[PDB]
Design a protein around this ligand. Structure first.
Ligand code: E3P
Ligand code: CA
Ligand code: CA
Ligand code: CA
Ligand code: ZN
Ligand code: ZN
Length: 169
């Protein structure tokens, strides 16, 4: 695994997030739950906590967009780039953007929002790309048909090197 240069990292363990808008492809309930499940991937093996905020500015702002969408990193229509995320820091640090030209799903048809989000949140938390083909932080989108996603050992090691492991006894 690899961490971002400068080892940009969250100093607080209690993070907040907020979904600013939604993709039409899935119900709101379904989108909220994917992102929640994506966060649990990482908080299960660390002392990090993710709390939904009702309004205002959360540590991790989550949104959808197409093409030119408000920053200087436009999306590219269907296929190609699926999402992008900013490394830990103030303001736009931690924020994740997802390309709504993609068809998002909770299954195998389209791109699976949960798996893309889980990979993107790895970035928000300070992981770069892994050279290990079995890694969640591997740079190529990869589908799995497993009910209970198992975060690969490479990512566990990577994220624990930043934040230590999860709780005890
Ligand atoms: N093409 C680009 O320039 C951007 C850069 C932004 C970025 O890298 O974040 N990449 C993407 O959009 C693809 C983002 C991406 C999303 C998901 C996954 C992804 C990787 C592995 C598994 C997986 C790993 C183990 C078991 C089952 C699934 C799932 C999703 C990889 C890259
Ligand atoms: Ca795209
Ligand atoms: Ca932020
Ligand atoms: Ca869409
Ligand atoms: Zn963006
Ligand atoms: Zn990536």
């Amino acid at each position: 695994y690899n961490v971002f240069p400068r080892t940009l990292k969250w100093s607080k363990m209690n993070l907040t997030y907020r979904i600013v808008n939604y993709t039409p492809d899935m119900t709101h309930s379904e989108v909220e739950k994917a992102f929640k499940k994506a966060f649990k991937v990482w908080s299960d093996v660390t002392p990090l906590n993710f709390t939904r905020l009702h309004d205002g500015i959360a540590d991790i702002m989550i949104s959808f967009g197409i093409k030119e969408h408000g920053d200087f990193y436009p999306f590219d229509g269907p296929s190609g780039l699926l999402a992008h995320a900013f490394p830990p820091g103030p303001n736009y640090g931690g924020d994740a953007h997802f390309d709504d030209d993609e068809t998002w799903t909770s299954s195998s048809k389209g791109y699976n929002l949960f798996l893309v989000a889980a990979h993107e949140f790895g970035h928000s938390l300070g992981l770069d790309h892994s050279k290990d083909p079995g890694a969640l932080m591997f740079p190529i989108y990869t589908y799995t048909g497993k009910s209970h996603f198992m975060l690969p050992d490479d990512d566990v090691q990577g994220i624990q090197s930043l934040y230590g492991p999860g709780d005890e006894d």
